[PDB]
Design an enzyme around this catalytic site. Structure first.
Site, PDB file in Angstrom:
ATOM      1  N   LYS A   1       0.895  -1.138   0.000  1.00 10.38           N
ATOM      2  CA  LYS A   1       0.000   0.000   0.000  1.00 10.38           C
ATOM      3  C   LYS A   1       0.941   1.196   0.000  1.00 10.38           C
ATOM      4  CE  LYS A   1      -4.145   1.579   2.267  1.00 10.38           C
ATOM      5  NZ  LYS A   1      -4.927   1.210   1.067  1.00 10.38           N
TER       6      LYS A   1
HETATM    7  C1  LIG Z   1      -6.643  -0.414  -3.990  1.00 10.63           C
HETATM    8  C2  LIG Z   1      -7.184  -0.684  -2.605  1.00 10.63           C
HETATM    9  N1  LIG Z   1      -7.705  -1.975  -2.567  1.00 10.63           N
HETATM   10  C3  LIG Z   1      -8.264  -2.514  -1.439  1.00 10.63           C
HETATM   11  C4  LIG Z   1      -8.309  -1.714  -0.292  1.00 10.63           C
HETATM   12  C5  LIG Z   1      -8.943  -2.457   0.876  1.00 10.63           C
HETATM   13  O1  LIG Z   1      -8.074  -2.849   1.871  1.00 10.63           O
HETATM   14  P1  LIG Z   1      -8.436  -2.807   3.427  1.00 10.63           P
HETATM   15  O2  LIG Z   1      -7.203  -3.381   4.088  1.00 10.63           O
HETATM   16  O3  LIG Z   1      -9.486  -3.739   3.763  1.00 10.63           O
HETATM   17  O4  LIG Z   1      -8.570  -1.327   3.748  1.00 10.63           O
HETATM   18  C6  LIG Z   1      -7.817  -0.360  -0.173  1.00 10.63           C
HETATM   19  C7  LIG Z   1      -7.873   0.490   1.097  1.00 10.63           C
HETATM   20  N2  LIG Z   1      -8.293   1.881   0.628  1.00 10.63           N
HETATM   21  C8  LIG Z   1      -8.839   2.802   1.509  1.00 10.63           C
HETATM   22  C9  LIG Z   1      -9.094   4.238   1.055  1.00 10.63           C
HETATM   23  C10 LIG Z   1      -8.180   4.737  -0.063  1.00 10.63           C
HETATM   24  C11 LIG Z   1      -8.109   6.256  -0.068  1.00 10.63           C
HETATM   25  O5  LIG Z   1      -7.438   6.739   0.870  1.00 10.63           O
HETATM   26  O6  LIG Z   1      -8.695   6.802  -0.974  1.00 10.63           O
HETATM   27  C12 LIG Z   1      -9.222   2.384   2.943  1.00 10.63           C
HETATM   28  O7  LIG Z   1     -10.178   1.526   3.212  1.00 10.63           O
HETATM   29  O8  LIG Z   1      -8.445   3.008   3.877  1.00 10.63           O
HETATM   30  C13 LIG Z   1      -7.254   0.121  -1.385  1.00 10.63           C
HETATM   31  O9  LIG Z   1      -6.714   1.354  -1.558  1.00 10.63           O
END
Ligand SMILES: Cc1ncc(COP(=O)(O)O)c(CNC(CCC(=O)O)C(=O)O)c1O
Ligand SMILES: Cc1ncc(COP(=O)(O)O)c(CNC(CCC(=O)O)C(=O)O)c1O
Ligand SMILES: Cc1ncc(COP(=O)(O)O)c(CNC(CCC(=O)O)C(=O)O)c1O
Ligand SMILES: Cc1ncc(COP(=O)(O)O)c(CNC(CCC(=O)O)C(=O)O)c1O
Ligand SMILES: Cc1ncc(COP(=O)(O)O)c(CNC(CCC(=O)O)C(=O)O)c1O
Ligand SMILES: Cc1ncc(COP(=O)(O)O)c(CNC(CCC(=O)O)C(=O)O)c1O
EC number: 2.6.1.42
Lengths: 304, 304, 304, 304, 304, 304
Positions: F156
């Site tokens: 990430k």
């Molecule tokens: C490409 C992507 N895939 C899957 C996920 C899901 O993973 P989790 O571990 O369950 O969170 C996220 C989390 N993204 C965000 C928001 C992104 C932004 O800041 O715009 C989140 O749920 O914190 C993401 O950025």
């Protein structure tokens, strides 16, 4: 080295086992071979998963339509024969089926026959004297494994190894002990001469054959031993970075047996030593030759 | 066949040119080779684009880091030497650099040397007695050429040919004279042992090396002859179906020379006979050996 | 719509030109077709690049081995016949060769024949009454074009258009007038029903056929016209983003003629109008029917 | 042929089931269809997995956004009707939903409707009179299956079949009974009109839908019957060469039912006859129409 | 470091050029930037291809739809200002347009604006104090360049560089000076921060943008200088192994200018020193800042 | 926004938490971050799967070799500290590790350190005030996810999101609430900011990490919860069209929690509402903060 080599049925002195320089396989990579180990066990000299190896040798030849006059049983007999003839109690065996002196031109003439050799000789740890114990440092290669439907990667053929030479030599030139190659899709395939396993959260992972990985016989044995040990096994595609996040990493193979990988691309795996699950599998493997691990699948073929 | 073969500097009788069955290249496809033709010309026996071929041999070895002790000039001298020694006025020459008896294990030991052979012998038309004249029937294979960055296709290495065996043997089994393979992208690559050319609206087309095609020396000569003849040449990726729409189709190679392709997958090309542009190029090619075509590039090396 | 349709050699009134619902093409996309335009000119009614279109029709059939009983000359006379039978001076012509009522099962029975239709009728600008003049807003589709060696994209066959439907309908549902599709590699291919051109620094660019683009006959005429105008043309692979950086962008096709693209994905191209180069090309094209542009290639076939 | 065909809500006579030659699907492959079998059984005429097929028919239309005015039960009632009306106790049913006479241009006008047809007729073994018993000889095609995200292979649409024509006709022209196609990745996809299954060491294997294979209803039924028999099933990607190493190989489909494959590319599979596992599955399958196999899933829709 | 930095229309002092830690670009790589050099010349301080760089900066922003409130000339004036204000006659300029403190969440809120910064400072040879003269040792990386249609490589955006970090750090950790990356196809793309050029038989080669290479401004300049010198140039896909067979190899870039590559993966290129063609091009390039090379294109923007 | 932000070990008032514009991450996407949620529960304020998120943060850094001075326990205490310092009981936490002011040039100088931020603040439903309750309309983007082995998608990192911006903004511009991206192979990957799940016949499906999908922590919890509920889960590659045939579809993420998807590309999913299975899973998830769902895995870290 050894005294004799089985050659088209005959026990030939090592130095007399020669072929013409115009032999097809020297020019076109047209041969199929196997790696088999004979261990000095509690049951005496035994050939590990012997039938499985001769069966794979036949399969490799079948894919290329190389005519093989010897049956699997006859090949096994020859193998045991050559081990005893050289009076070995432990050894590495190299069966080789190849297109010989049949004329130039990649396509052999109709009606041709193949030549077959089976050499037995002592051979140490594939990756070093300290490899099995302390693990080795691996590197992800810049060279990729053969793509599906180009040259069959389920077949163990001589020509395949130009790739393994590029992959393996690169790792060694950069100071590593072995190279791990990715397939044409960017996923983990296998080592230059070994299959690749990962351990994450107590579960064992390894790429499928469709990731351009050889259907290793050690690999298969490990998957079966793991299930006997109650370890979950998942055969699935693996990302390149999974190597850095895995709790443990190890390579498998007839020559390499079970070798822990303590680091990849300079990144330490776990504590930088043999992992707990890798150790369980390693002990379960070598236990097959001490009697500690019951041979439930019939993997130890008596040489006599 | 012939009386002698040049072997590591020595003129060895044909039957004495043998190597151990444990020679590395028989097990790992670790060799690089060339195909060269000596023609009986208006200038006497001449080796066609000799330096170019030895240069490619060196390039192939360099890619795999195979140590070569002979210089290009020394290889050329040996080649001329072996042709004269066998008293040939026309012949096919097969230089072969290979990893010999250096031990098992895909990675050769540091400090190893390669063995080199150069055999000369008469060899007829690669695709048949009527091939050059009437053309041959080609088939698009179900097997694909090696993908980029797996095994270098710019290199002419022994191991490469497992692919050519699969491609070529399939076409022959189905009743065709040669197979045309597509790369992993589904575009035209080359023939099993030839490069592929198309003629459409008076323009000559052929795939680039990046389409997994060998940088053919006959191919290169054709491109140069075509420009001399005022024929436009476009080296570009070609679709599989372009084979059915082209006005003419032909294959090129040292063994195959210039062979018209009268049909592909049973679909007739043009009138089903040698095409007009193919004929111009073919005559311009063979004219190099009668004096009709001025050797402006210095492609005829005197054997003596 | 019009009064008559040429159907297998005879003029059938439009309403009676029907086929059985068990016609092969209705179930397996087994048909090939063309789009041709007849224009009013100083020479009276003229079909633009008539023979080239009938030749491509023949080529499309050849690729699928659909037997065609009509010669190119016969198809040309039939086309001119339907144009006159319907009292048309300008029109869109739709020849259609299709496997008819021959039984179910994708492979038609040996010895089958194809049915052939040729309908002519007035048809307005493919993309709108203001398309040619003011340009259109295009969208890059989320659906890709057929991969090489799956279904030949050099052919204009019915089954191909399921893809065109997905791409074109998606652009239309999202508020745009036409969709531009990328090939399986992620590069610009073509529009759902037209070829794509870009202009940058006075140079004209358009993807090659290997980018899964149909070898448009309008595309071909534009390239030839452009060269006459002294405009440099480059047939090469183009990136998706090159659409946002091009000085001009336009689409070509028999139906869409030359339609400028003022914006792509909402991003304005140039000034947001027909660029100067697109303009030069468009005037040269339409000039063919006024005589202002000399018909140097013989593209105007008189209907009489 | 038969006497009646269901056409847009009414049972019309066969000879009257016609549509205009300018029907969309005839020019753009815009149709979706199905294949269904009615078997004579220990319970009279039964339609196999009737609802499942009509559901897939609906699913196919939905992907292309073809409007369907009939509900699944109305289609089922119409199907049952066509069988009865034609006095058949065993037959092949072909439901076809297509974009009809709605005007030229790949994008149909807003608010259009589809024409629906349902024909029933007696149809024998798809791959031959001896197929089911003796098995057939298969060939791996030189044409690849549609790539993901180009033309949805999850849908059974008319245009999809240009590919099946190329794959199937190639095998037939070369003397085989059916062709097996690889996807754009080089992995096994499916037969031209059947799904592909392999048996290795007692485990049943078949490619996933993501290998560009149609979600066959016979395929799904076989997976379920297999599990009932205690046979392990693995839906996974399969290498091209796995076809030569499998113990057994067979194809599944509505028309082809369960047909053993005794050889692939001339290489004999197992003993060259129906294998033991294919035997158990085939018996379980046909056991449904005798009562021997309890219809635990409700796959038999009585015609009455 | 320097004393002033242009920040949103005003010349602020270096230490005051700060933004919030919650600035979008810091969390989502949402920025586009450039690299520009100011040279001391026979005409005083000159910015090389000043407008071209600011135009690309604009192009990059446009692809991502980042709003830019400054025109190309305002940016140019600001750039010239930062150089003067800091009293530099030779320096490296870094314009950076980024999404700032606009709130969390990858999608910025409608109507937001970007922050713009322009720093100037003295920066030496990118690849070392001896780079330009002696050449450097390059390594082909095990990491591939972004695939087409994922993250537009035509744009110079911040997020793009995670890849360049992996490629470049790997070469450096292995003892090389720079890494060369292959695209997802296995072909040569570009160096981690430079474009790649090869020289073979007097012809200059470099990959097209479609090989995932940045449309370098130094690259473009070199192509133009080359043609002026009568050197043929070919923008085409290049194989990985072509690096070992090229007569000469060099990298181009704003920071790296024109740096010879004396070896790739430990394999010596040519004589292991700057090649003759790289020599001519390098002299022509630097000849611009002495007057020796006439600035025929207007690439020198006087700072004053 | 809130009053304080943890910055390198100290609580800095929000407004003063700033960085220099020459900070590495602003120019090269060199940062890794996390998204964590703190929930009000029966146990008071609790951070959901706190350690797992900090571990992933550490993993993301490890992959890029970004040195991290804080231990996992230290980062956890700092996070709980900022939650309390800001008087929050429920909130969104954003940890950010980034390369700071260390000089220009993608490769940071040896011995560098990273800066670390942890901001906590209230944040509403990621996709809308009615998203969790009524579902959202999704769109399949025309932009693909990063290819394997280019930029690790298991990490990430900031630079990754240029892709998320393209995909998410495209859905939003066309009238949808979120975009779903396909990988370079044409299969379902994930949403711009969340993982994708499908429900079909009572079985839950979701793409593996090799489909270029982030190993979501919410995704992981859902899979574990689903198994508790007796729901079968299958991590496998999914086709683009499977979205139109699924019984239910929902998105998961720390920010978006569990958001049902009522339609895809305008095609209604199921009844157009939160499906029953999505419902079961959603109630089980939120039940964790009421105690209705037993915290069997230890996912609730008390803030105190
Ligand atoms: C490409 C992507 N895939 C899957 C996920 C899901 O993973 P989790 O571990 O369950 O969170 C996220 C989390 N993204 C965000 C928001 C992104 C932004 O800041 O715009 C989140 O749920 O914190 C993401 O950025
Ligand atoms: C590419 C490759 N992959 C996997 C394996 C593992 O397969 P096993 O069936 O478990 O042996 C081998 C065996 N290779 C060697 C040595 C190769 C060499 O000769 O250098 C072996 O273990 O005999 C291999 O060459
Ligand atoms: C795959 C392949 N492609 C192209 C060529 C053409 O290259 P040229 O440089 O123009 O020769 C050859 C040469 N192959 C052979 C024969 C191969 C064999 O030994 O069967 C030849 O012409 O010597 C080849 O093997
Ligand atoms: C996919 C596609 N690409 C390019 C072209 C352009 O080729 P031209 O030879 O220059 O015509 C067409 C022609 N398409 C149409 C209309 C398709 C439809 O019937 O909807 C035409 O111009 O007749 C096309 O269908
Ligand atoms: C490409 C393809 N794959 C697999 C299948 C198998 O799916 P089932 O659901 O189990 O039938 C079919 C059905 N095809 C045919 C015959 C094709 C033709 O019309 O010639 C069928 O069984 O009706 C098919 O066309
Ligand atoms: C990936 C990449 N390729 C090619 C180039 C060459 O393009 P030019 O337009 O000719 O400059 C650059 C510029 N990169 C740098 C330095 C990267 C860094 O900031 O470390 C430059 O020359 O400013 C680059 O980043």
């Amino acid at each position: 080295k050894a005294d004799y080599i089985w050659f088209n049925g005959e026990m030939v002195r090592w130095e007399d086992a020669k072929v013409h320089v115009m032999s097809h396989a020297l020019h076109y990579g047209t041969s199929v071979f196997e790696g088999i180990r004979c261990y000095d066990s509690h049951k005496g000299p035994v050939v590990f998963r012997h039938r499985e190896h001769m069966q794979r040798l036949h399969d490799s030849a079948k894919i290329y339509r190389f005519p093989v006059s010897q049956s699997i049983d006859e090949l096994m007999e020859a193998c045991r024969d050559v081990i005893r003839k050289n009076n070995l109690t432990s050894a590495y065996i190299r069966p080789l089926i190849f297109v010989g002196d049949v004329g130039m031109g990649v396509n052999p003439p109709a009606g041709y026959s193949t030549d077959v050799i089976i050499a037995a000789f002592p051979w140490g740890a594939y990756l070093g004297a300290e490899a099995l114990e302390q693990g080795i440092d691996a590197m992800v290669s810049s060279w990729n494994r053969a793509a599906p439907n180009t040259i069959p990667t389920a077949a163990k053929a001589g020509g395949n190894y130009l790739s393994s030479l590029l992959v393996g030599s690169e790792a060694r030139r950069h100071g590593y002990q072995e190279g791990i190659a990715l397939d044409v899709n960017g996923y983990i395939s296998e080592g230059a001469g070994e299959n690749l396993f990962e351990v994450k959260d107590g579960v064992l992972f390894t790429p499928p054959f469709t990731s351009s990985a050889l259907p290793g016989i050690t690999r298969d044995a490990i998957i079966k031993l793991a299930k006997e040990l109650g370890i979950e096994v998942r055969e699935q595609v693996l990302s390149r970075e999974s190597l850095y996040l895995a709790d443990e990493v190890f390579m498998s193979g007839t020559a390499a047996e079970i070798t822990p990988v303590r680091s990849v691309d300079g990144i330490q795996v776990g504590e930088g030593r043999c992992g707990p699950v890798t150790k369980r599998i390693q002990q379960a493997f070598f236990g097959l030759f001490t009697g500690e691990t019951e041979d439930k699948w019939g993997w130890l073929d008596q040489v006599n």
